[PDB]
């Protein structure tokens with residue numbers, strides 16, 4: 001990332017902290033630093049973490065360290081925010097989870113006295129407490145300089161707020177999800193927490209306070225079992241709770257009622273992010289925040305790619321999303337270093353990341369100035385803004401008719417293309433092409449193997465288009481140049497690598513009829529088409545039903561089940577203008593322009609507007 005730089009701020013086996021025991025304080029070298037949380041309190045940067053004094057092993061001696069800086073991270077002061085009980089050589093305060101409100105740092109930690117096993121394996125709660133400490137940040141301008149100070153109060157146990165029973169089950173322990181939590185728009189302090197029951201299942205809840213931390217409540221709902229280390233933000237009046245699932249894809253939920261109800265975010269972010277290339281390795285803590293960049297509300301998300309496997313968790317990656325498009329900003333860590341946990345802060349229009357580096361299970365936290373990354377982010381955000389503005393600004397055929405909708409518009413294939421790719425105007429997922437000739441606002445295809453392939457599950461580890469398994473609208477303009485020998489494809493969602501098994505699609509045949517394909521149902525040819533005429537094609541799928549529209553009108557027989565109510569589809573890719581498979585004997589001679597993908601089923605007016613504005617939406621002229 002050109003322009004970016006970093007320092008080893010919390011340096012393993014080197015950085016010292018003020019270790020207090022029985023009224024005596026000694027500057028003490030720390031073996032490992034883990035669990036970064038990086039925040040802004042009134043212009044003061046504060047970096048909170050675990051100081052694992054003797055080893056990186058989880059069940060060992062740990063205090064919560066804080067560093068703070070008034071100069072954007074050039075210099076820092078160092079404190080212990082929270083000390084462990086000092087009961088034993090493995091006493092520890094763990095998983096520090098931070099909320100900023102006003103001048104206050106709320107830090108929630110589990111506290112353990114003597115156990116040498118990880119908390120989820122405990123059969124009881126005898127070794128556990130849950131503590132809240134408050135740090136009060138003040139600033140001084142005495143002497144013509146800015147000086148900050150943080151006064152940490154004594155921790156208070158919140159155990160009294162943990163019910164012995166929850167929706168049936170009996171509770172054992174809970175911890176914060178680590179990293180940075182939030183103040184909701186209603187002022188509530190909101191911690192996503194990870195909780196165990198007596199069956200040793202782990203699940204996520206919302207733990208919240210309506211009275212500045214004095215009392216706490218749990219929402220009655222929960223994630224699925226197996227969801228740990230939850231991280232949350234508030235988006236459009238809802239909490240978005242992004243969870244770690246060891247050995248599986250991350251589950252993401254939305255709750256509008258402080259955790260009383262949880263709905264999997266299948267239409268947006270759930271199941272997008274895999275913990276390793278084959279999504280069969282441990283997960284991670286993640287930074288997940290909502291921020292406003294160049295006037296646009298967006299979300300930033302970090303997770304390692306974990307090519308190495310196990311808990312090594314190399315290749316920390318950064319992602320940008322507006323809850324519609326999902327852009328890979330790139331790799332924050334360096335080379336193949338192990339770099340699991342992280343915390344991203346956007347402050348005074350500068351981007352920073354405090355994150356782990358691990359060699360031989362000795363961990364430092366580096367403090368990175370993400371200059372290259374913010375440059376890419378602003379570029380991408382300007383492209384999103386530009387194209388949304390382009391589409392929204394179009395005076396559609398009436399005065400002007402209804403505006404073309406950009407709500408839920410995820411991808412758009414128009415004029416830009418290279419020799420082997422059709423480029424997404426939204427810059428997230430290009431389509432691969434074969435036997436494609438560039439024409440205004442699209443591509444012309446010919447010959448066996450021709451077409452374009454827009455990957456869905458084929459995206460691999462990180463599946464930005466997973467939403468399509470639940471609902472989508474796929475729109476294009478198509479022109480047929482040659483009468484085919486038999487039924488030939490134009491547009492569709494494939495369930496397998498070849499395109500032979502379809503969820504929903506549209507073909508055309510030698511008798512000048514359309515052949516809409518509804519899942520595995522026998523195909524009934526219908527309607528009529530003419531060579532050389534530009535047709536508007538809309539495929540919609542929602543609530544397991546698929547519809548095919550030509551020139552804004554449903555084909556006779558549209559609105560059929562395409563998904564057996566038991567299973568959830570796993571779309572491989574969308575195919576456009578052919579299958580893009582030389583193993584498929586069809587030869588589609590067609591031009592396709594302006595392909596739009598939405599994460600929802602468009603309504604009647606929206607479809608009609610798109611049909612009527614086909615000649616106006618191309619990116620060529622702009």
Ligand SMILES: OC[C@H]1O[C@@H](O[C@H]2[C@H](O)[C@@H](O)[C@H](O)O[C@@H]2CO)[C@H](O)[C@@H](O)[C@H]1O
Pocket residue numbers: 056057058118311361
């Ligand atoms: O490697 C650091 C990492 O260890 C994880 O714990 C693993 C451990 O790595 C593995 O050797 C052992 O067999 O199983 C453990 C989990 O039961 C921790 O989860 C993680 O926090 C790190 O401490």
